[PDB]
Amino acid sequence: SISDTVKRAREAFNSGKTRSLQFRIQQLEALQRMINENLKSISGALASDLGKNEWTSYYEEVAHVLEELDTTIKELPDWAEDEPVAKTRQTQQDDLYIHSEPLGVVLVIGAWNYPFNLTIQPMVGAVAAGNAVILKPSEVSGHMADLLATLIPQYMDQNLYLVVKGGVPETTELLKERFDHIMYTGSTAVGKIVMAAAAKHLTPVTLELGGKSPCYVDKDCDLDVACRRIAWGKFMNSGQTCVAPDYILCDPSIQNQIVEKLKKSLKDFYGEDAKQSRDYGRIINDRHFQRVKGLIDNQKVAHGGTWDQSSRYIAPTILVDVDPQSPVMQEEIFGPVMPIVCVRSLEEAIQFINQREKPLALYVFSNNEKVIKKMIAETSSGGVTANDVIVHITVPTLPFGGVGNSGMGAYHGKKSFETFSHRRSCLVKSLLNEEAHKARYPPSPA
Amino acid sequence: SISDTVKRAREAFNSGKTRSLQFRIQQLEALQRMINENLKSISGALASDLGKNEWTSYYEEVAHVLEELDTTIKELPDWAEDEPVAKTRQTQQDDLYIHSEPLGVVLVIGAWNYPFNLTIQPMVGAVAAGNAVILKPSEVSGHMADLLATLIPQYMDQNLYLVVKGGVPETTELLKERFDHIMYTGSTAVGKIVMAAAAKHLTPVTLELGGKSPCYVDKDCDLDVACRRIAWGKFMNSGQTCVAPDYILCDPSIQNQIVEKLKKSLKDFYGEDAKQSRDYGRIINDRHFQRVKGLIDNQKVAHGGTWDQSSRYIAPTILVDVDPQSPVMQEEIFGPVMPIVCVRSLEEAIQFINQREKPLALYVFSNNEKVIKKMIAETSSGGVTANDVIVHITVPTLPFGGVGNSGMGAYHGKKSFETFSHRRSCLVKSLLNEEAHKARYPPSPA
Ligand SMILES: NC(=O)c1ccc[n+]([C@@H]2O[C@H](COP(=O)([O-])OP(=O)(O)OC[C@H]3O[C@@H](n4cnc5c(N)ncnc54)[C@H](O)[C@@H]3O)[C@@H](O)[C@H]2O)c1
Numbered sequence: 001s002i003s004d005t006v007k008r009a010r011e012a013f014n015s016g017k018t019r020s021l022q023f024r025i026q027q028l029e030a031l032q033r034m035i036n037e038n039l040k041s042i043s044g045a046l047a048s049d050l051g052k053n054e055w056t057s058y059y060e061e062v063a064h065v066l067e068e069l070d071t072t073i074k075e076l077p078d079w080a081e082d083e084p085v086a087k088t089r090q091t092q093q094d095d096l097y098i099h100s101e102p103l104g105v106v107l108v109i110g111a112w113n114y115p116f117n118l119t120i121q122p123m124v125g126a127v128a129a130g131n132a133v134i135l136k137p138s139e140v141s142g143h144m145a146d147l148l149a150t151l152i153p154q155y156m157d158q159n160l161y162l163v164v165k166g167g168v169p170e171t172t173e174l175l176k177e178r179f180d181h182i183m184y185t186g187s188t189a190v191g192k193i194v195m196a197a198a199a200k201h202l203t204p205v206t207l208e209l210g211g212k213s214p215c216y217v218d219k220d221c222d223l224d225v226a227c228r229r230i231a232w233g234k235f236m237n238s239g240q241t242c243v244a245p246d247y248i249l250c251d252p253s254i255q256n257q258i259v260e261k262l263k264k265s266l267k268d269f270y271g272e273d274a275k276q277s278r279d280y281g282r283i284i285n286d287r288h289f290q291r292v293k294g295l296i297d298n299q300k301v302a303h304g305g306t307w308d309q310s311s312r313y314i315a316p317t318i319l320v321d322v323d324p325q326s327p328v329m330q331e332e333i334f335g336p337v338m339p340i341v342c343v344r345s346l347e348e349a350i351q352f353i354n355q356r357e358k359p360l361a362l363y364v365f366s367n368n369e370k371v372i373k374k375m376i377a378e379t380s381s382g383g384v385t386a387n388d389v390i391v392h393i394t395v396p397t398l399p400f401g402g403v404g405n406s407g408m409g410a411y412h413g414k415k416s417f418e419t420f421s422h423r424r425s426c427l428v429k430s431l432l433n434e435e436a437h438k439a440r441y442p443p444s445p446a
Numbered sequence: 447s448i449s450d451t452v453k454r455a456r457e458a459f460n461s462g463k464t465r466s467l468q469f470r471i472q473q474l475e476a477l478q479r480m481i482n483e484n485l486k487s488i489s490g491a492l493a494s495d496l497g498k499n500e501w502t503s504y505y506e507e508v509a510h511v512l513e514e515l516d517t518t519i520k521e522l523p524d525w526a527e528d529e530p531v532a533k534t535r536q537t538q539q540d541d542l543y544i545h546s547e548p549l550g551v552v553l554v555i556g557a558w559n560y561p562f563n564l565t566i567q568p569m570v571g572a573v574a575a576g577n578a579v580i581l582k583p584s585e586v587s588g589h590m591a592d593l594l595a596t597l598i599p600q601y602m603d604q605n606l607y608l609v610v611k612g613g614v615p616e617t618t619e620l621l622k623e624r625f626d627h628i629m630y631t632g633s634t635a636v637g638k639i640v641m642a643a644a645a646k647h648l649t650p651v652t653l654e655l656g657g658k659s660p661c662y663v664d665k666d667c668d669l670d671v672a673c674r675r676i677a678w679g680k681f682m683n684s685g686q687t688c689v690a691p692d693y694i695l696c697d698p699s700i701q702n703q704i705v706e707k708l709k710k711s712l713k714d715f716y717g718e719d720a721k722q723s724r725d726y727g728r729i730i731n732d733r734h735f736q737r738v739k740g741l742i743d744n745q746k747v748a749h750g751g752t753w754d755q756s757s758r759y760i761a762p763t764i765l766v767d768v769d770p771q772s773p774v775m776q777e778e779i780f781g782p783v784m785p786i787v788c789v790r791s792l793e794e795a796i797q798f799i800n801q802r803e804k805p806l807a808l809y810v811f812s813n814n815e816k817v818i819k820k821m822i823a824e825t826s827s828g829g830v831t832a833n834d835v836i837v838h839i840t841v842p843t844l845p846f847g848g849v850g851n852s853g854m855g856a857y858h859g860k861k862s863f864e865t866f867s868h869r870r871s872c873l874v875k876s877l878l879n880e881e882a883h884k885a886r887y888p889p890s891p892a
C-alpha cells in the first residue's frame with residue numbers, strides 16, 4: 001500500500017507533466033486557494049492541537065506560508081532560467097551555464113508544534129522545482145494531520161501530491177521506499193534515523209533539528225525594549241518553537257532587572273493570569289506536559305511555576321541563578337520555562353556557548369555594535385538575529401537551516417527551489433569548429 | 447591511535463588559528479610550493495601507480511590543482527566577506543547578510559585513478575574555508591599514498607592538516623570518529639557506507655561516486671572532430687576516468703564510420719601499436735585488469751582486444767553491436783573498452799538514458815542546437831558537455847557533482863569554499879529603537 005502510494009507518485013512524475021512551468025504555477029495557485037478558502041478549518045485544527053486562536057494561527061503560521069507562496073509564484077520564471085556562468089580565457093567562445101531540474105519524488109516529514117507551517121511551506125519549494133511530493137504530517141498534532149489529508153486532494157494534483165498519515169510504524173515502512181530527497185524537521189535523535197534510512201538509497205536530506213538557542217544580553221542594552229522582544233519570542237507558542245530563546249546569558253548585575261521587565265511584558269500580553277488570556281497557548285500533550293513541568297523542580301522559581309494538568313497549561317515561569325548542569329540546562333526546553341544563567345564577561349558567554357552543540361539560533365542584545373560582531377565572529381549557529389528574536393526565519397531572502405546538531409541544509413524562498421532541484425553544470429561548445437585544442441592531444445612534446 | 451590524530455586536529459582547530467585569513471593564504475601558498483618543488487616526485491609516484499609520464503601527470507592531474515590554488519588564493523578575501531542580502535519592506539532599516547564560517551574537521555577520502563588531484567584538490571577548498579583537514583589517501587595507488595604522507599608534514603601545519611594511511615580496517619575505525627564534513631570520491635557501494643557512518647554523527651557528506659556516462663552522437667555532426675574529441679577523453683588514463691564517455695549511443699547508419707574515425711585518431715595519439723606509446727597509461731592493478739579484460743569476452747571486437755597481463759596493458763579496444771544486457775553495459779567500464787550501442791532515434795537515445803541510474807556526465811555531439819537542448823532538457827546527470835568530453839570538470843566557475851547514484855554535493859572553485867563552510871544567515875537590528883512592532887505582540891485585536 002504505502003509502496004503503491006510512492007509508485008503512483010513516481011510514475012506520475014515520470015509522465016513529465018511537472019516539466020511545464022505553467023503547470024507548477026497552477027498547482028501553486030491551487031495551494032494558495034486551498035489556504036484562503038479554508039482559514040477557518042485550519043485555525044480550528046490548530047486550536048484543537050495547541051489551543052491557538054484565529055490570530056496566533058494566521059500570524060504565527062499560515063501568514064508565513066502565504067508570503068512564501070507569493071514570492072515564488074512571482075519569481076519562479078526567473079528562478080527556472082538557465083543561470084549563466086563566468087567564462088575563463090579557455091572558454092571565451094563557449095557557453096557555460098547552470099541548468100536546474102526536478103529531483104523527482106520528495107518526502108516532506110513535518111513536526112507537531114507548527115503542523116501547518118513545517119509541512120506546507122517546504123512543499124511550496126518542492127512543487128516549485130517540479131517534484132512530486134509526499135507529505136507525512138505529524139501524528140502528534142492529529143487534528144491537522146486529518147485536515148491536511150482531506151484538503152490536499154481537493155486542490156492539488158492527486159497523482160503528484162499525496163499525503164500519507166501515520167505514526168512511527170507507518171513512517172518506518174515509508175522510509176524504506178526510494179525518494180530523491182527527504183525534507184525532515186524534528187528531533188536530533190530521529191534525524192539520525194532518517195539520515196541512516198536515506199543512506200541506503202544515497203538520497204540527499206534537508207534536516208532541521210534543534211537544540212538550545214542562547215540569548216546573550218549585554219549590559220549596554222535598552223533592557224526595556226530588549227526584554228519586551230525576548231518575552232514575545234519565548235512564550236509565543238507556549239515556548240514550543242525551534243528558534244526560540246531557550247535560556248538567557250547575562251551579567252549577574254542585571255539578573256533581577258531582566259526578571260522584572262520580563263514579567264512586566266508578560267503582564268502586557270497575558271494580563272495578571274496567563275491562564276485567562278486567549279492568546280496564550282497550551283502544551284501539545286501529556287508526555288511533554290510532564291517533562292517541561294519536571295524541569296522546574298529543585299530550581300529557584302522567581303515567577304510563574306504553576307500549572308493546570310487538565311488543560312495542559314504551564315504558567316509563564318522564569319528561573320534564576322540556574323545551574324548549567326541542572327536538567328533545564330541539559331535539554332531543549334520546548335515549553336514556557338526561561339532559565340537565566342549568569343556569566344561574568346562576554347568572553348565567558350562565548351566559551352559557554354562554544355562548549356555545547358551548535359544551536360539552530362543565537363541571539364545577541366546590545367547597543368555596542370562591536371559586541372554584536374564579536375559574538376557572531378566567534379560562535380557558530382544555524383542563523384542569527386541581533387537585538388530581536390525569531391524574525392530571521394521569516395525573511396524569504398534569508399535561507400533557514402542549522403549546523404552540526406541543529407541539522408544540515410536550508411530552505412526559505414529561492415534556497416528552497418535550489419535545494420529541491422538539481423543544479424546541472426553545462427558547458428556547451430556547439431562550435432564543433434575552430435579546433436585549437438591541438439596542445440591537449442598526445443603525442444607529448446619530445 | 448587514529449582517535450588521537452583526530453583529537454590533535456580538533457583541538458588545533460579549537461585554537462582558532464585558522465580564523466586568520468592570513469594564516470589560510472600562507473597554508474594555501476605552502477601547499478603550492480609543495481607541488482612546485484616536488485613535481486618530479488609527484489610524476490614519479492604517478493608513473494609507478496598508473497604508468498604516467500611527466501606530460502600526462504602534469505596536464506591531466508597536477509595542472510588542475512595548481513589552477514584551483516591560484517583561483518582561491520586570489521579570490522579568497524572576497525569569498526570570505528559577509529554577503530549582503532536583498533531587503534524586504536519589513537526589513538528596510540536592518541542589516542541582512544550571510545556570514546561564512548569553518549565547519550571544523552573535514553575528512554577527505556580520495557580515489558586511486560587520480561590519487562593526487564582527488565585528494566589535494568578538495569583539500570584546497572577545505573583549507574580555504576578555515577577547516578582542519580585529515581587526508582585519507584587511496585591505498586590502491588600505494589605510491590602516491592606514501593609520497594603524500596611525507597610531503598604534507600614538510601609544508602603544511604603539522605596540527606591542522608594530517609594524513610592517515612590505510613586500507614579498509616583503518617578507514618572503518620577512522621569513520622567512527624566525529625568530523626564536521628566528509629568528502630568522498632569513490633564507488634557507489636562504498637559511498638553508501640560512508641554516508642551510513644556519517645548518519646551516526648549527523649555529519650554532512652560530499653559524495654562523488656560514478657556511473658555510466660552516455661555519449662550520444664547525432665547524424666548531423668562533423669564525425670571527424672567529434673570522434674577526435676571522444677577518443678581523447680575515453681582513453682585518457684587507460685579509460686580510468688570518472689567522467690569518461692563510457693559508451694556511445696548512435697544510429698547504425700554511422701555505426702561503422704565512428705569506428706573508422708576513432709581508430710584513426712587512436713593512430714594519431716599512440717601510433718600503430720599503443721603498447722609502444724609512452725603516452726598510454728597502464729591499468730592500476732591485477733584485479734581491475736581482469737574485470738575490464740573479461741568485458742571483452744563474447745563480444746564483437748571491431749578494434750584492439752589484445753592485452754598484456756604482465757604490464758597490465760589492455761589495448762584501445764572497440765566493440766560494435768553491443769547488447770545492453772551484456773556485462774559491459776551493466777557496469778561502469780573503468781578501462782579502455784569502448785562499446786557502441788545503436789538506437790533508431792533521439793527520443794530512443796533519451797529513453798535509454800532515463801531508464802538507467804543518473805550518470806556523473808552526459809555528452810552530446812551534434813551541429814543541431816535544438817538536439818543539444820532537447821537532450822539536456824529531458825535527461826539528468828551530474829554535469830554536461832556538448833560537442834566535447836571531460837572539459838566541464840575543468841572550469842572552476844563550474845561546480846562539479848553528481849545526482850542520484852553519481853553522488854550528492856559539488857566542489858569546484860568558490861562552490862568548494864561554500865561547501866566546506868557554514869553559510870550563517872544574520873539579521874542585525876542593532877537598532878534597538880524605532881520599535882513599531884506593536885502589531886505583533888498580544889493581546890490580539892478584538
Ligand atoms: N516535534 C518537534 O518539532 C520537536 C523538535 C525538536 C525537539 N523536540 C523535543 O524533543 C523531545 C521529544 O520530542 P518528540 O517530538 O520526539 O516527541 P513525540 O514522541 O511526541 O514525537 C515523536 C515523533 O517522532 C517520530 N518517530 C519516532 N520514532 C521514529 C522512528 N523510529 N522512525 C521514524 N520516526 C520516528 C514519531 O512517529 C513522532 O511523529 C521534546 O523535548 C520535544 O520538545 C520536538
Ligand SMILES: NC(=O)c1ccc[n+]([C@@H]2O[C@H](COP(=O)([O-])OP(=O)(O)OC[C@H]3O[C@@H](n4cnc5c(N)ncnc54)[C@H](O)[C@@H]3O)[C@@H](O)[C@H]2O)c1
Nearest residue numbers: 557558559584585586613614617632633636639656778780
Ligand atoms: N577508485 C575509483 O575512483 C572508482 C570510482 C568509481 C568506480 N570505480 C569502479 O568500481 C569497481 C570497484 O572499484 P574499487 O575502487 O572499489 O576497487 P578496489 O577494491 O581496488 O578499491 C576499494 C577502495 O574501497 C575501500 N573500501 C572498501 N571497503 C570499505 C569499507 N568497508 N569501508 C570503507 N571503505 C572501504 C578500500 O579501502 C579501497 O581504497 C571497479 O569497476 C572500479 O573501476 C572505482
